């Protein structure tokens, strides 16, 4: 039924190799200002503890979440408590060392995200991501590029949102 149910996850997805810092490069979504976004991923059993840091008007904001394991390796679930609804996530493609293509589903809508260990992203990966977006029935105009400058990865106690 759900569009993400048919998206194939990374074979034998290894959270240990996926751990660390990832930079958000772009998002393909029919939904809807992009802020420099960094993720800090840490394995927690079968789940992954994820802190997202976003730079807004010179201030770094952190959001702590727990990506729960939904059974199949590489498939995760983000809870909903006061915001909107459940978000399903699948790490579809990654080499762990340079890029990751993730798919997300919110309210039945499928989006695609590209993350990188460092900038710039290779031409092959950028083109590959574009190909995946097209295959997801989205247009190039629905691809939003995020900042390549102004990243942050540390927030003070007054700018931390714990959703766990």
* HEC letters along 35-103: CCEEEEEEEECCEEEEEEEEEECCEEEEEEEEEEECCCCCEEEECCCCCCCCEEEEEEEECCCCEEEEE
Residue 126's DSSP bridge partners are none
3-state helix, strand, coil in the chain (%, to 5): 15, 45, 40
The number of CA neighbours under 13 Å toward the Cβ of 34 is 17
Measuring CA to CA, which residue among 77, 69, 121 is closest to residue 95? 121
> CA 28 from chain center: how many Å?
11
Domain limits at 45? 1-164
Return the CATH number at 63: 2.40.128.20
**Beta-sheet pairing, 109-116 with 20-28:** antiparallel
Cited resolution, angstroms: 1.5
- Report how many helices (DSSP H) and strands (DSSP E) the chain contains, helices first: 2, 10
Assign 142 to helix, strand or coil: helix
Q: The tokens of 119 are what? A: 């900038």
User: Which residue(s) pair with 62 in the sheet?
Assistant: 53, 160
Method used for this model? X-ray
Name which of 135, 72, 80, 105 is nearest 3 in CA terms: 105
Q: How many domains does the chain have?
A: 1
């Amino acid at each position: 039924a759900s569009p993400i149910s048919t998206i194939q996850p990374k074979a034998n997805f290894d959270a240990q190799q996926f751990a660390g810092t990832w930079l958000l490069v772009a998002v393909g979504s029919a939904a809807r200002r992009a802020e420099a976004t960094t993720l800090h991923v840490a394995p927690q059993g079968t789940a992954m503890a994820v802190s997202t840091f976003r730079k807004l008007d010179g201030i770094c904001w952190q959001v702590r979440q727990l990506w729960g394991d939904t059974g199949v390796l590489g498939r995760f679930l983000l809870q909903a408590r006061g915001a909107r609804g459940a978000v399903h996530v699948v790490v579809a493609e990654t080499d762990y060392q340079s890029f990751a293509v993730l798919y997300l589903e919110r309210a039945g809508q499928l989006s695609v995200k590209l993350y990188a260990r460092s900038l710039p992203v290779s031409d092959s990966v950028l083109s590959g991501f574009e190909q995946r977006v097209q295959e997801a029935h989205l247009t190039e105009d629905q691809i939003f590029y995020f900042p390549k400058y102004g990243f942050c990865e540390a927030a003070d106690q007054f700018h931390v949102l714990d959703e766990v």
